[PDB]
Amino acid sequence: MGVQVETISPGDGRTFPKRGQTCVVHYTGMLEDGKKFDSSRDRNKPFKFMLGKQEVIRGWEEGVAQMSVGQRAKLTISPDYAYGATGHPGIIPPHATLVFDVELLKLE
């Protein structure tokens, strides 16, 4: 599959990221089994990226673009939209479906 977005708490339902905007998020990244491999929350600092610059996996570019400011959503991303057949040795295994818990805090 592509990226599935499932809402946890709604956003304003009106402010959606456009290409070139900086998204400011908190996120927790887990393998399909639930093992957490990354989290901005555990660093106590939100994460920023610019939409459309491929600073993040494809599933993020496509999934966060469907969120409104303030929304918290569960994104499920297939390996082709993620780290693929190769994965990331020692962190993400081959052919891994990834689940992300993402809150879109604001746009800059």
Swiss-Prot record:
Which proteins does it associate with, and in what oligomeric form? Interacts with TGFBR1; prevents TGFBR1 phosphorylation by TGFBR2 and stabilizes it in the inactive conformation. Interacts with ACVR1B and SMAD7. Identified in a complex composed of RYR1, PDE4D, PKA, FKBP1A and protein phosphatase 1 (PP1). Interacts directly with RYR2 and RYR3. Interacts with GLMN; rapamycin and FK506 abolish the interaction with GLMN in a dose dependent manner. Interacts directly with RYR1.
User: What's in the keyword line of the UniProt record?
Assistant: Acetylation, Cytoplasm, Isomerase, Membrane, Rotamase, Sarcoplasmic reticulum
Gene Ontology molecular function? activin receptor binding; calcium channel regulator activity; FK506 binding; I-SMAD binding; macrolide binding; peptidyl-prolyl cis-trans isomerase activity; signaling receptor inhibitor activity; transforming growth factor beta receptor binding
Q: Which family does it belong to?
A: Belongs to the FKBP-type PPIase family. FKBP1 subfamily.
Signal peptide interval: none
Residue span, PPIase FKBP-type domain: 20-108
Note the InterPro entries from the entry.
FKBP-type_PPIase, PPIase_dom_sf, PPIase_FKBP_dom
Query: By what name is this protein known?
Result: Peptidyl-prolyl cis-trans isomerase FKBP1A
Recorded topology in the membrane: Peripheral membrane protein
Q: Where are the N6-succinyllysine residues found in this chain? A: 53
Question: Which catalysed reactions does the entry list for this protein?
Answer: [protein]-peptidylproline (omega=180) = [protein]-peptidylproline (omega=0)
Any matching Pfam family: FKBP_C
Q: What is its EC number?
A: 5.2.1.8
Report the function annotation for this chain: Keeps in an inactive conformation TGFBR1, the TGF-beta type I serine/threonine kinase receptor, preventing TGF-beta receptor activation in absence of ligand. Recruits SMAD7 to ACVR1B which prevents the association of SMAD2 and SMAD3 with the activin receptor complex, thereby blocking the activin signal. May modulate the RYR1 calcium channel activity. PPIases accelerate the folding of proteins. It catalyzes the cis-trans isomerization of proline imidic peptide bonds in oligopeptides.
- Is Acetylation among the key words of this record? yes
- Which GO biological-process labels does this protein carry? 'de novo' protein folding; amyloid fibril formation; heart morphogenesis; heart trabecula formation; negative regulation of activin receptor signaling pathway; negative regulation of transforming growth factor beta receptor signaling pathway; positive regulation of canonical NF-kappaB signal transduction; protein folding
- Give any Gene Ontology cellular component: ryanodine receptor complex
* This protein's record includes keyword Membrane: yes
Q: Which residues carry this modification: N6-acetyllysine?
A: 53
